[PDB]
């Protein structure tokens, strides 16, 4: 609870090593191997199927970008 003033935010992600390992293994190539996706869930503490789902979500969460530049809303 510090940093400069002002924050402008709302819903927060899960963990920094969680979103970091997700966007990393996804930005490195496209998908990771069962042993690799497991390293995530193992480091991120999930259930594998969750990573798999994380990747799909990350595919559903990425599209959210490149669409708020103009903000013609």
Swiss-Prot record:
It is found in: Nucleus. It comes from the Eukaryota. Residues 7-66 bind DNA. Sequence-specific, AT-rich binding transcription factor which is part of a developmental regulatory system that provides cells with specific positional identities on the anterior-posterior axis. Sequence-specific transcription factor which is part of a developmental regulatory system that provides cells with specific positional identities on the anterior-posterior axis. Binds DNA as a homodimer. Interacts with MEIS1, MEIS2 and MEIS3. It is linked to Hand-foot-genital syndrome: A disorder characterized by limb and genitourinary anomalies. Clinical features include small feet with unusually short great toes and abnormal thumbs. Females with the disorder have duplication of the genital tract. Guttmacher syndrome: Dominantly inherited combination of distal limb and genital tract abnormalities. It has several features in common with hand-foot-genital syndrome, including hypoplastic first digits and hypospadias. Typical features not seen in hand-foot-genital syndrome include postaxial polydactyly of the hands and uniphalangeal second toes with absent nails. Belongs to the Abd-B homeobox family. This is Homeobox protein Hox-A13. It comes from Homo sapiens (Human). The chain holds residues 322 to 388 of 388 of the full protein.
